[PDB]
Amino acid sequence: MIPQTLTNTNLFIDGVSFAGDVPSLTLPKLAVKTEQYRAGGMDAPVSIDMGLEAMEAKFSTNGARREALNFFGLADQSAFNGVFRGSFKGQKGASVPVVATLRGLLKEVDPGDWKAGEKAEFKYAVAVSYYKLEVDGREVYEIDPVNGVRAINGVDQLAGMRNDLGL
Amino acid sequence: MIPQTLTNTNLFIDGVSFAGDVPSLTLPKLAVKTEQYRAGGMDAPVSIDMGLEAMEAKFSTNGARREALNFFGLADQSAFNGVFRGSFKGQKGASVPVVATLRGLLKEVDPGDWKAGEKAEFKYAVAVSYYKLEVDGREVYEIDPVNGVRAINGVDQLAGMRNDLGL
Amino acid sequence: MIPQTLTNTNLFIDGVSFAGDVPSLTLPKLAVKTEQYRAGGMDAPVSIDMGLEAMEAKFSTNGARREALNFFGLADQSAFNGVFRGSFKGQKGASVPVVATLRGLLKEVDPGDWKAGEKAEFKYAVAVSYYKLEVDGREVYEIDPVNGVRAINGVDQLAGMRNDLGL
Amino acid sequence: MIPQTLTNTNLFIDGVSFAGDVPSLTLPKLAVKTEQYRAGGMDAPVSIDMGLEAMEAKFSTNGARREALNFFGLADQSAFNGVFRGSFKGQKGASVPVVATLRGLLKEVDPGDWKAGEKAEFKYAVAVSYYKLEVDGREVYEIDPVNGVRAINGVDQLAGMRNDLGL
Amino acid sequence: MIPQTLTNTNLFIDGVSFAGDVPSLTLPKLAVKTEQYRAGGMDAPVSIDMGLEAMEAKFSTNGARREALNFFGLADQSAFNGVFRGSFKGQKGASVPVVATLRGLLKEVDPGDWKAGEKAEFKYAVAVSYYKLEVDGREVYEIDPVNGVRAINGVDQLAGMRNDLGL
Amino acid sequence: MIPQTLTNTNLFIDGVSFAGDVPSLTLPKLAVKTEQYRAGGMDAPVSIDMGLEAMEAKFSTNGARREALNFFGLADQSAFNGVFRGSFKGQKGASVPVVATLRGLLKEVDPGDWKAGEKAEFKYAVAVSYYKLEVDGREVYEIDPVNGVRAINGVDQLAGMRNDLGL
Amino acid sequence: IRDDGYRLWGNRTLSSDSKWAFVTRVRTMDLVMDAILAGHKWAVDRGITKTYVKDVTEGLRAFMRDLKNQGAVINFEVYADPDLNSASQLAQGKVYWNIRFTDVPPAENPNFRVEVTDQWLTEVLDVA
Amino acid sequence: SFFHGVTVTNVDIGARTIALPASSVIGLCDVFTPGAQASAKPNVPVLLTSKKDAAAAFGIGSSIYLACEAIYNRAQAVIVAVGVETAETPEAQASAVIGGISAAGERTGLQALLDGKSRFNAQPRLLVAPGHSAQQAVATAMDGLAEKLRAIAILDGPNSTDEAAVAYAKNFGSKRLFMVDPGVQVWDSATNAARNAPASAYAAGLFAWTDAEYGFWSSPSNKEIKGVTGTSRPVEFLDGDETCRANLLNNANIATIIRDDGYRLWGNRTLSSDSKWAFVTRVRTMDLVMDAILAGHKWAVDRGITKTYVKDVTEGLRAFMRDLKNQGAVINFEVYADPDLNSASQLAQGKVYWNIRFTDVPPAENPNFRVEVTDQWLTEVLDVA
């Protein structure tokens, strides 16, 4: 392979670009909910899946930025839309985009300490109700809890439970 | 956008200015009270809102400052009024004010360690019973728990529950 | 065998899907009515069967859900129909459906405590007048008290008493 | 469906609003009085209905609140009127009201333990003599024991027994 | 002695192995039916035996497992056969098998609560009509209520009552 | 002995080589599940074994690397195969390979903070369902929980419990 | 049809095309778009940036999975038209999208194939 | 036109025939008449999943459909069926069931079952020619095609005596052959009497049913043939070192049908002259351990040889072989790359070798009860004691 690393990030909240004031992004940690399964005739657990964990995407701005402050605590959950973008560089110069469109509830706004000479950072966190990760313009993840979809290469892994539940 | 950052803070307790002795401010962390909601026909939680969390604004002085010491522990809760102000600078020189009028109970006074050569810092914390955040002179937040109001762009998000409860 | 566990549930009341708001299901506990039988020439009881116990299936919703509230206390007992579905996962990925069509009287509606920030859960319970459990689309149980049928693999165990009673 | 959950409650006793001091409500548990019916030619009981159970609605205040203390133990039973209200939120922001007008006898006042630093909670309980549950402004339940009415969708289920008894 | 402890369990229902999905076993509690016997010339009871108590062996699976579901409630009582096996380890590494062949009526199937992310456990219970416990391949217990046999080291303790009753 | 130390690592996920972008590997921590055993006639516990703990192997990439992102959260658990390789150097120049083929469920994908100038590291973690460690091309460990195998020098330690359970 | 004039009965519209036979097909296609349009009124202003065409698709897919959720459609498909999004079209303000979906079919004709047998004439009505 | 509302229709349909859905595929070849409602060209294989799909492609009065009804009463199996047209003389009929490449370039008869995969993704693991495998020429074309297609051909003898079955079973010493001699006597609804049936299709429906519930390593040798009312000859399973008819035919490597109005297929020896390949358990397990190994390692024919190509196949082969030890197909396999024959001159040609030794589960062919009547417990009871 080629040594490849992120060099640049961007954020689109509602189509508006945050191309001056987002120092840090955080994509949601996709964790499956394992239960360590030890049963008869075996000495070690085996970790069956039980569904996904709850996803939170957090991000920080350090200006005022009403274009992200006005999405806190709306009555409409899953109305914060948002696109986390990253450019992964690579040694040969072939920049690969990593774009994570996501949707949910902006669940906490954390204006930190305001010291005078120190940079003040508004920390936000969203409660992700839809998540699609595209790498090099190709769908890697697509997670929609309601309308239960877990696509991993465009392949919906929950077609098994969908016919079982009659969904 | 323009790279924008806080450069200066100020504090008004009861109209009196603390323009010499407040090294740090902290606006209240607005967190919505999410419950991770996993139910039938879905593999991941979805985080319904359950109302806001409790708001605390904390701030520190490091002189004596009876004009903030005399508001601790009054019989009248929500009698500590207070205005947290910030000036966010911006690269082009357009300073944007961030002013957070708030009201509540000054709930702890924390005089720290008093070493001789070291700066001694009185840490305070208020229990916020009313909170309005204005950015560039425009109402972003307005949270009043009693008389249940949660305005996010001047738009009261709790008009739905207000007619349901007959408030 | 393969380590196999439920991952997802669903509920159909009258064909309507509860695919957003059923956090817990409970299939009816099939208990046979044993009497501990100690008699002549023996030191220990032996537990003859005396028929089945009464079956209750209970389930909870935590929204309003008139589509289940409107089946309480009808004059027509055994008019609550209902399908409890489950998807049992398995380690190799072969999801096995467990579907329990059942019919009876919705006998109690239990709206619990209504605290403000806390999730409110309507607990229901039905009095099961017909019960068929299919596992992997194959009939395991079929219990119909009136028209006395107790099928265990498609094999009606009560054909013995049916000819004795002239049913 | 949409994931829907209560977020807020309210209480009206005699038109007066308890919009500051009711931490918990409890609607009456509607249970039908089943008798497990096992008879000839059948192996399992079938649970015929025998009427409704006795309804109690309980609620707590934790201030003094003479506007609910003055309804205990009156000579006029069924003189405590009262409206339990709830706002069920929903993910898309469509708040659905659940309003339960009820009438009966305030049958116990339970001032709990009074410790100094601990919140003191007056627990009340009413003996419900009339109960109407409206969900989204639509009549779900209407139970009036005297003048025997059990309406489940506006449909009086006791019209059968009413003509039989000549009521 | 050597510190010795169970490390592993297994279950055979009808020769089929449950070597993936039995998290818990329970051998039947062998209790003798004592009556506290206080009589003339004595200050304390003395607990004469009156025979054995009723034996129940219970076990749980947490997959679907029709190979144990299809033995509930058959017309043939004492047709559930079953072998509970355990491996007791020991500090020096000498694993001692504890194998309990048993026979009876599978008297209750208890599918518990079905929450989505939570492991769902089918709890079963059998009504033991024959029980033989072998430890290190040597008969410890052998209890057959009909054909009254209570062997404790291969020694039938009920040879006394067998000749008295003419069995 | 000779002073010997790792100098280089490699990773094969599904035969594809990650020879440019895996900065850190972590083999699963093999811990036996001890219970501290204190009993009669002894002053100190003695720690009997109760089987192995649950194994997790974690590893990080810091490019995009769909060839590891596409194995998260599949329906097929134990479908992530993977080979962790290490080269332990030694002072005299005799490089000893340490190769750990393993198999399981890729249970969490943790894209960390995305700051602009900072290297962004995708942290992964697998839930190990099979583990074989070869050192100098010789089998040290072989752990397969289902089909209970714990080989320590090619010697299966669980042959004792295998005959006891009839596996 | 019944019971002192009780129930409206047909569901075919007056169309000469079997693709548009049911009013379910005509009403769903008509009111999938009226929910799509009233909900994307921001796409007639908001001058074309780079991610204009991407923010409409993810907006169109989001207001279309709300329709698959409540049962209006079954497994939609929304994508920007790759062959007709020129830059000569984009200077005129035109930009195209493709919003394929499948409508739910009405249960127009349930068919009962009923038979009277003498199969269970021995299984009961006998000494057995 | 159409209809709106609910129709009711009085229509006779005959008493549904629920069976476990099986994954095994069956190659079938028998006679039918190409007519109007029979929507099948003669020497063209068609994939079948239903009795309706068998009676829509072939006639309901055909001999294909009677063979397909014989399978669908026991398993809901996939059947690649080739409807060979009828002919006058049995020399020309056996020549048409065998078939060949005698077309322009097409494959006819049994040879069209080699086209079962790549036409339908169903490579037939069971080969049956009901009523035609009694001829020695067809049963050799069954043999050589079961060797190619890696299947078990299910033969049948004639309607005649036991000695005509034994002398016909001495014509074959082949591993892939499984003779079931006594025909099935099945009750015909039309004539209201018991029609004969050649019993090869009833074996193949049970052979594929055993793969569903019990797995392919289990023997079909005591399972229940459904939809049958008796055999053509009464077959006699008795004991005592006797000339039992069930024991005479098993020692000629023929399976029979033994009890209860023709209830259970009985033998489990194949027609092999080698005691290493005596049981069909041995032949079917080795055949379908590899079909799970191959279909599952299709990535090893592309994927040009890197350094860890040979290591990633072994750990892939061991992983798809501990899944077989888990469910009980084998017991303690052994997979390793062949150290003596993996040259680099072989590797330039793309050849690379592996060794996949395993042990099959033995069938409980002969349980032996050594029963004795004693007077030992004549004093322990029946006494004052």
TrEMBL record, chains A, B, C, D, E, F:
InterPro entries: Tail_sheath_structural, Tail_tube. PANTHER family: FELS-2 PROPHAGE PROTEIN, PTHR35861. This is Probable bacteriophage protein. It comes from Pseudomonas aeruginosa (strain ATCC 15692 / DSM 22644 / CIP 104116 / JCM 14847 / LMG 12228 / 1C / PRS 101 / PAO1).
Automatic annotation (TrEMBL), chain G:
Residues 15-117 form the Tail sheath protein C-terminal domain. It comes from the Bacteria. Belongs to the myoviridae tail sheath protein family. This is Probable bacteriophage protein. It comes from Pseudomonas aeruginosa (strain ATCC 15692 / DSM 22644 / CIP 104116 / JCM 14847 / LMG 12228 / 1C / PRS 101 / PAO1). The chain holds residues 259 to 386 of 386 of the full protein.
